[PDB]
Amino acid sequence: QQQAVLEQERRDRELALRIAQSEAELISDEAQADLALRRSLDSYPVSKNDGTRPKMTPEQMAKEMSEFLSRGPA
Known part of the structure; x- marks a missing residue:
């Protein structure tokens, strides 16, 4: 197992050191950027499908006022 614990230990330190030196240096x-790009699954732009376009339809203003008036005191 020597080779295991050996290469594992040495490696562990190496990497750990790279991340520490990298994150500390903030050069990496x-x-x-990469991880951020792959993490930003929402890379694609916005897609309209709800109808949030200008012009408030009676239903909209009605839902707003209705929801507003109906809420609570303070």
């Missing part, structure tokens, strides 16, 4: 911005 490429990683953040």
